[PDB]
């Protein structure tokens, strides 16, 4: 399975993986001064990052199926899209990019929000055109999206 992290960035159980350099999530970064859910509306932005927002606390942008976002999180993430959970589909009509996800599989991928509230992935490089949405969520965690 892959593996989640701890607040501290410490691997919870198997072994650590380095997320991909292009990935919207860069490492090491702080989080989990307190669980704040955003909706679909309401994303943090960059400026949110050291003074936080009317909402909460910001450390980026985490997602899980429902969909549920969050502008921080203090519980088990993934850094990586658990890609053994997704499923290969037709591309959806999208709501909104949310920013670029290492898989499972160390490769990149293009993250969006589709019209249906599915979670979605698409190789941004080499493999391109393998398309996946986020369909078990067994551990019910987030990936952690983008750092601020
Ligand atoms: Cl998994």
């Given at each position: 399975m892959e593996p989640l992290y701890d607040k501290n960035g410490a691997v919870l159980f198997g072994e650590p993986s380095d997320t991909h350099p292009q990935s919207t999530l860069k490492?090491?970064?702080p989080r989990g001064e307190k669980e704040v859910i955003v909706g679909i509306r309401d994303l943090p932005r960059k400026g949110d990052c050291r003074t936080g927002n009317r909402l909460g606390p910001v450390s980026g942008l985490f997602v899980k199926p429902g969909p549920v976002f969050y502008?921080?999180?203090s519980?088990?993430?993934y850094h990586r899209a658990p890609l053994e959970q997704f499923k290969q589909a037709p591309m959806c009509?999208?709501?909104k990019r949310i920013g670029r996800?290492?898989?499972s599989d160390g490769n990149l991928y293009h993250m969006y929000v589709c019209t249906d509230?599915?979670?979605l992935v698409k190789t941004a490089?080499?493999?391109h055109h393998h398309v996946l949405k986020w369909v078990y969520n067994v551990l019910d965690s987030p990936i952690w999206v983008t750092s601020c």
């Open positions: 490492l090491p970064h502008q921080d999180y519980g088990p993430v009509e999208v709501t996800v290492t898989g509230g599915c979670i490089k080499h493999h």
